[PDB]
Design a protein around this ligand. Sequence first.
Ligand SMILES: Cc1c(Cl)cccc1Nc1ncccc1C(=O)O
Ligand SMILES: Cc1c(Cl)cccc1Nc1ncccc1C(=O)O
Ligand code: NA
Ligand code: NA
Lengths: 116, 116, 116, 116
Amino acid sequence: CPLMVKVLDAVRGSPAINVAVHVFRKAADDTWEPFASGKTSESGELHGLTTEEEFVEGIYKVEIDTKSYWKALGISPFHEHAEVVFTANDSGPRRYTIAALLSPYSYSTTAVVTNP
Amino acid sequence: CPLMVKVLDAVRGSPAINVAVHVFRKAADDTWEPFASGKTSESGELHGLTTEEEFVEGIYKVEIDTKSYWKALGISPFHEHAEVVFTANDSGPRRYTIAALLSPYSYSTTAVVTNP
Amino acid sequence: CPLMVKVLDAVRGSPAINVAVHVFRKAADDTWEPFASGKTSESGELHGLTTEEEFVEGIYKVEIDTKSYWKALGISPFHEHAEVVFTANDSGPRRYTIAALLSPYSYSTTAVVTNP
Amino acid sequence: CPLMVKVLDAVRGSPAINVAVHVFRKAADDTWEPFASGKTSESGELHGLTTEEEFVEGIYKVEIDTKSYWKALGISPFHEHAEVVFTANDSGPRRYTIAALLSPYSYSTTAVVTNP
Ligand SMILES: Cc1c(Cl)cccc1Nc1ncccc1C(=O)O
Ligand SMILES: Cc1c(Cl)cccc1Nc1ncccc1C(=O)O
Ligand code: NA
Ligand code: NA
């Protein structure tokens, strides 16, 4: 699998567990079409979203449902969700990790792109 | 000025100047309607986007055009843009500062919310 | 004011008020000598730490007393403090803003450096 | 091993490879005594720094030698190093991951503390 998502909690110092993640691919008419989805594991990670054959070049959006995560902890958050929008490019390294670090009023996101 | 956007560059240690910003508001049919737009000044700040009268309750999306910023400086970055999606004014009028700190493969965003 | 410190709270979406800050400068025997100190105001900012005359070339350490900040709000955080260590004025006088964004188990820090 | 260090590069979107890391423990006279050290691997990770028997409660400092990392890439950085100072506590979960995300003029750090 060429795409993994990892989510961390900056308030508790822990993985962010059971967070819903939705991935979309941009269609030719500029709409966002559902591509893959899941929930983070006990390690904060979501594996197996796609395959090499399916993950062709194009623009993708990863939506992390942060508002529901904070509400289940009893904490009032700012954002509706965190959105990560990027182009997949076959020239570059082949494995994409999209990571996010969550606080109630802030988030940080980075990409780690590597070649096995 | 109940909505201000501030952008910093983590590579240069400077304000991020001339960054385009587009704000949208979710309409009653669930589409994103254009609401306001502008670009950051020499201080990295974008003022004057809206007014207390026009900035009603709603779900707003602040799109910060990070790719165009980096490409103008000769850098091929990861993200298409940074998107900040939040509900505003649901407990009455507030003042919002949306800030972002930019790197080629990462960004952080936070909100400062005050009650005038 | 060639040195300013700004601190934000990522849990509340607000300035971090009443945060103690201690600045040190490395001496010719390699020890950290006390240089200046203060606390952040209602805006999260600490002004007036030093002057253009006293802020000579050197290696400086800005210690932001994050643990004491969180403990006063009822939160047991991870870090003792946040430390920012940098060489200043090695190409002539500059103005430095040291900013930090705080969560219980995380912090981000960045510098804005300008030439007056 | 109860302590792991992980370092990421926000400019290149990659692990930060071959970064020197030094760990110190605070002594009774308030000085910092060398405890363990190493260099990050090709995955940006440094394993095997200590053992359960040796990693007793106390105050520790993790110094990440970011300045040398950026200089070897040809990039002028701001900080001398990144410093992470924290108390180890036997009550909490048993495995500490200290992670840092590096840019030339900024860094973010978080702790992930979990129980096997
Ligand atoms: C310091 C910082 C980090 Cl580390 C990350 C994101 C924004 C900021 N800065 C701000 N964020 C919100 C409002 C104001 C600022 C500022 O730096 O003036
Ligand atoms: C340490 C950190 C910060 Cl400070 C901010 C955002 C992500 C991370 N962590 C990661 N980011 C990307 C890929 C992996 C990780 C990780 O911590 O395993
Ligand atoms: Na309401
Ligand atoms: Na010089």
